[model samples]
Target: NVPELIGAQAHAVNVILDAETAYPNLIFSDDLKSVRLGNKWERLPDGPQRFDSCIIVLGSPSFLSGRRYWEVEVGDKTAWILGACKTSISRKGNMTLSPENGYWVVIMMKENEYQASSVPPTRLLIKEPPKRVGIFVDYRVGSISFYNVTARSHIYTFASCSFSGPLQPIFSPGTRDGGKNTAPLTICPVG
Candidate 1:
């Protein structure tokens, strides 16, 4: 391992899942550091910032311009979506996350199947499944890169990103497949 996460950790930020922005079915840890899809829906006021349809959740710590890195532990979860997204992205109605909607995410649609959010979604083949994933972003440069922290390997980078507005970490633990994907997406501390 080259300690690739070290370089990125230089700009690490402690990300907390903002429960107010989570969909009704996304349950969060008491500390707001981990999130998972809950079978029972939560009853919260449907604010404009709340995710109404998708099982998505947004993290705190908005960034306008700077290098920032954060890691998420997915454990053995077979489905998830992780990355950074604009704070202004629509959380109302049904919206598929992508650059068009101000969200740039790396998705594991299912086990071993990965994709990057693009006008035309880009396919990604990661040699090793990531138990821990690190996302690094240089807001000024419009750069967003993903790494498999578990394998110490680079995953994929969103190209020609035109990021505007303050961006924050975003995640989706994905739907539970009758308990097949029950792992919570945990925010990890950077060393």
Candidate 2:
């Protein structure tokens, strides 16, 4: 019943980074379970579905309703952002990662400061860094909560969220920082 256990833990659902939605400067494992910043930008065809400026990729297995949990292994990456984004979020520019902008995410800056994106992002004061983040989304209740899976601690929550359309997880491993911040953002299976 391990598979059932996996699904029971916050209703875990398998999601993978969508290559077609990734920026040219980002690289992903062949299986698309992980993503990281690359040194050189790749030559990929231009399309509106692709991110033009942001170093982000949208995770697949879009869900329109229900509660589900997705886990991401951020490792020691200094600059990365993770959460759910509306499918219709703008992919053209480096838009603000706010809920109004359809991005409900938790971001860790290169300096190691954490913030939960809002109209004005809220500064997070966690005593310890999370190695893996577990995101829980209850679509019907309009709530999204982030947790420190490694420590089994709660991180932050976005209350009263509105889902205009379907949802996809946002995977951004930010800048490589000359190799200092080149860790991969991996979607780990939960159980």
Candidate 3:
């Protein structure tokens, strides 16, 4: 019976960084067991990492410890750090790198039975910045559009997208401070 219950093992390490909030930290080694955040950095396997109802804020005006911390969006709503940045989603996924200026992004999807049709899963990338940024999940056309915060036509599209459930948008304030982890933001229910 025990053997039958066992399934293939996978790691669940996910990091979330939002520039819209203060604190601006990291969450490492997230698995089926427990999810670790801030000051504690470790490695985890590939599994279901959920942040359907959360907000993140990240960034540092200047590196504090002789390090140049750029911003990042690591599955979480907010993030900030120094040196080179890398992210891994699952065993089948690759680690995407971010350039200096940093960025803030949101991933939206429907939770359960009300699933969207042929939706292409998406992840936010923070390679560089141009003053401000924005993301639009257009379910009408099954696509996601990445855009500049100030411009009209600067955008990229992810065709074949859908979200038949609650929509969650991640944001960042573009600056860093010391008190972000006080209380976790309330994410809407998964209907």
lDDT of each: 0.84, 0.84, 0.26
Question: How would the candidate models be sorted by TM-score, starting from the highest?
Answer: 1, 2, 3
lDDT of 3: 0.26
What is the TM-score of each predicted model, taking all chains together? 0.92, 0.91, 0.28
Clashes per prediction?
A: 0, 0, 27
Query: For model 1, how big is the CA root-mean-square deviation?
Result: 2.5
Task: Please give the RMSD to the true structure for each candidate, in Å.
Answer: 2.5, 3.7, 18.3
Residue pairs with colliding backbones in model 2 are none
Query: Would you give me the overall lDDT of model 2?
Result: 0.84
Best by TM-score: 1
Question: For model 1, what is the error of residue 174's alpha carbon versus the real structure, in angstroms, after optimal superposition?
Answer: 0.4
User: Residue 124 in model 2: shift from native, Å?
Assistant: 0.6
Candidate 2 per-residue lDDT over residues 1-191, each given as its tens digit:
01222332658888888888989878889988998887774545667788888888999888899888889998888889999998888898998888888889999986659999986879988777889988888888788888888777788888888776898899899888777798899899874
Off by over 4 Å in 3: 1-129, 172-191
Model 3: per-residue Cα lDDT at residue 43: 23
Report the alpha-carbon TM-score of model 2 versus the true structure: 0.91
Question: Regarding lDDT, does 2 or 3 come out ahead?
Answer: 2
* Poorest stretch of ten by lDDT in candidate 2: 1-10
Q: Pick the candidate with the highest lDDT.
A: 1
